[PDB]
Design a protein around this ligand. Structure first.
Ligand SMILES: OC[C@H]1O[C@@H](O[C@H]2[C@H](O)[C@@H](O)[C@H](O)O[C@@H]2CO)[C@H](O)[C@@H](O)[C@H]1O
Lengths: 130, 130
């Protein structure tokens, strides 16, 4: 379910967002979604424990686009983790705890991200945006 | 007017929450609301620029209880402000940047808070809950 939702971010290129939180002992997945509203997302970052893969995708009027899969998966159920997202113009970059970077294109050319939600087995304990 | 909403907080007595953010240049008020759901609030903390007062209250099934008004008002439109809230057994203590504390009684004897929202002219930039 919906853990966290924020509206009216005014997050722009050069922006950095730091999300720390607890992954449920029973999690099968969680997602950090960034866009302009629930049905329009620049970045859906979704670690999936069953397939041991991080899937990224974008959502356009509630239509999912073509996903990207990263098999560098060092997430653990029951743990507290820090995820850093950077809004880098033509792409998003997600830095993981092990220092791996997941890169995802800013396909639809957002210049501002106003909406965030976090769903699934992830309880936010710290959030910072600049 | 809804800016930030979290569910499943699992925040318990002895916990501390830090909410720092930017008060809109054109803000008239903002509110930090903590409780069990949007209709049952242990704490509604509402600084109002049109009255220069902080109104506090609790909400019991969409009924407001007795207001507590704090005339100590050192808030400024357009500024960034850090607010700390401590969940104690008898009360919520809200620590303000200038050292003033607002003590609001824990009228409904909550020992767990699962719901937070922030409304109005306040953009969170740093949130932490423990
Ligand atoms: O008590 C919190 C509650 O206040 C409402 O506004 C009040 C106002 O504080 C009071 O002085 C006047 O007599 O009645 C108003 C309406 O009941 C707000 O509507 C609500 O948002 C809360 O902030």
């Amino acid at each position: 379910a919906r853990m966290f939702e924020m509206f009216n971010l005014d997050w722009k290129s050069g922006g950095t967002m730091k999300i720390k939180g607890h992954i449920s002992e029973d999690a099968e997945s969680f997602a950090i979604n960034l866009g302009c509203k629930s049905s329009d997302l620049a970045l859906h970052f979704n670690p999936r424990f069953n397939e041991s893969v991080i899937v990224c995708n974008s959502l356009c009027s509630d239509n999912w686009q073509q996903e990207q899969r990263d098999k560098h998966f060092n997430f653990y159920k029951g743990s507290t983790v820090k995820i850093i997202v950077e809004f880098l113009g033509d792409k998003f970059l997600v830095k993981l705890p092990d220092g791996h970077e997941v890169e995802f294109p800013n396909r639809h050319g957002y210049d501002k991200i106003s909406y965030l939600n976090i769903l699934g087995g992830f309880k936010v304990t710290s959030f910072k945006v600049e």
